[model samples]
Target chain A: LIVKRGDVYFADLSPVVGSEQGGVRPVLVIQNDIGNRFSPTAIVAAITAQIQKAKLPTHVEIDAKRYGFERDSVILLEQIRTIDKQRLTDKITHLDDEMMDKVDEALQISLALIDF
Target chain B: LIVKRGDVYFADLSPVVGSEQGGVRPVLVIQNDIGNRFSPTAIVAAITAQIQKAKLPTHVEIDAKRYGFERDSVILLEQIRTIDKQRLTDKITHLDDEMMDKVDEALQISLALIDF
Candidate 1:
């Protein structure tokens, strides 16, 4: 199975320590196509059902209904993680181009790539 | 108190929710000097004592002893946060230029700026 960037999946990110995001949750595949297609492990960012009331500039808010998500979802750009491809199950949906663009923008903010 | 980039401090990151790193812990001020000197709130990355056995490329490991840290330390570049200057208490030590360079490399990795 070839995973692609912008694809959302339900992944098992379990057995984590410290402040790592754990358990089964929705995640967005953010790795490049080459890495996603060939690498045994793929990079991903966890998605939460939080309402995003904090208005964190680095967190990308998405309309759940549009993506067929059960609840309101926000991509946690700060919590990027890598997990085995086998851990990813049940493709949630591929995020649209507009949303992925926002993800890119938030990625910049999360990593402090945006200088002012 | 001016919080310059690469400066370490013990900050009160309390009143957090979810997997957010909380309590009073050491944080690396990552905002530019201008923002540090002028802004009431500064951007920072959390630091943890976890050994760098995983060799996560995005995580920048630093020698605690060199920085007057009590033990091993690794900068959690993935967990960046913004907090008021008042929350930052005791200033620990400033990270050296060499280490800050490594942080820049890791920042690139964390943000997927390196296309490979």
Candidate 2:
């Protein structure tokens, strides 16, 4: 389960229930390396090819070819999920530091984790 | 502007811009007493009569009349805004301590401040 934050991997997120997003898709690893290295499960935000979702304050838009994605995608921070590391495979790419900065802010806004 | 964290008041959120929730409506003061007492402005989450918004993870539901509201309402944690105290008038009611607990938890989830 060797993965780091910002790594994009293909993951199976079946067994859908409630509002949980389902299907095998690209997910952005968000858990810090310490947890990713030792934990059986890692946290990630699901990515969607639905670029229009980028209008949402909780979603971050990323360039497709620039980040090893096959098409335009929006990272839905509000869809954060913890899954078994075994579910994640095939590292697609890692977001650059600049892009990770955007991810951090998007996560912050999605979670409302900011001083008013 | 002597207000506490759980106080609800009607505010004029006119002059909408971008995705900001607009209109004169009920808003729950979420700023700590220290800030509420001293700051010219206060932080609050807008309350909506549309109870359906309660389905969102960031929205908290409360009884209507029990909290001085005329109709069913949902506290939209995601609709947080900082407004001048002058914009708020007529203290509606105070949320009970128990209800405040739900508000706190909803805010935590809305901001993704929870430990995984």
Candidate 3:
């Protein structure tokens, strides 16, 4: 299972189920090379087409056009998960640098990357 | 039990079936007051006595004197987990402002709270 940044793959983000925001949705790969190479799993956050239902700091809206996005999607930073590599299926598009920066920021806020 | 930001408690960070990072170890409570209040589980990073083996960005060392630590310990940001509040037992000491700042940055790096 080869995964990388910006590659949107079909994922099963389910059960502990909130809003069916689960079961075979687009999950954007967020882990780096070291993580993806060594681990049996990959870390990811949900990229939802329902652009308006989520909010920021916790959620970051991405430029769908820039990344060859499948739809109007937003990155769900709060919805981060580590799933088996077996779940990832297709490469939608490689994410660009600028958009990836925002994704990074969203991860920071959700993960709390700052002065305590 | 009312878990607070600075509290150091004995925690069972024992094996996830792979390593010795778990068991009745010292864990630093890193979540905010609101997180502690509303959630039944608290986010914690393991504070291990093995200071040298656990290194930085992934792990943040705490001031033994500042936090009244019983022994040298490092905050294992890489080992962050959302454990049951019941796992946190016996408050050891309240972390100081300075040491906590390091803890915060350690969290940022571990959590990637910055521009990617």
Weakest ten-residue segment in model 1 chain B by summed lDDT: B107-116
Quality class of the docking in candidate 2, CAPRI style:
incorrect
Per-model TM-score on C-alpha atoms: 0.55, 0.51, 0.59
Q: Interface root mean square deviation of every model, in Å? A: 8.8, 14.8, 5.9
lDDT string, candidate 3, B74-93, tens digits: 77665555566767678888
Clashes of each: 0, 4, 7
Question: Which tens-of-lDDT digit does each residue in A26-95 have in candidate 3?
Answer: 8777766555565556667777887744565657775666567656678776565556676677767777
Clashing residue pairs in candidate 1 are: none
Candidate 2 lDDT at B88 equals: 81
The residue-by-residue lDDT of candidate 1 on A1-116, one tens digit each, is: 69988999998876544444667999998766665665566668888885644256757887778877888878876666656677879998899888887887776665555643
Cα lDDT tens digits, model 2, B1-116, are: 68888999998866543344678999888765655676566667888886644776667887776777788789976566556677888888999989887887776555444443
Candidate 1 is graded, for docking, as incorrect
TM-score of chain A of each: 0.90, 0.92, 0.85
| Candidate 3: residue B21 Cα off by (Å) | 2.7
lDDT of each: 0.72, 0.73, 0.64
**Model 3 pairs in collision:** A108-B113, A113-B108, A113-B113, B13-B22, B13-B23, B14-B22, B14-B23
Question: DockQ of each model against the real complex?
Answer: 0.08, 0.03, 0.14
B113: Cα error in model 1, Å: 5.1
Cα displacement (angstroms), candidate 3, residue A100, comes to 4.4
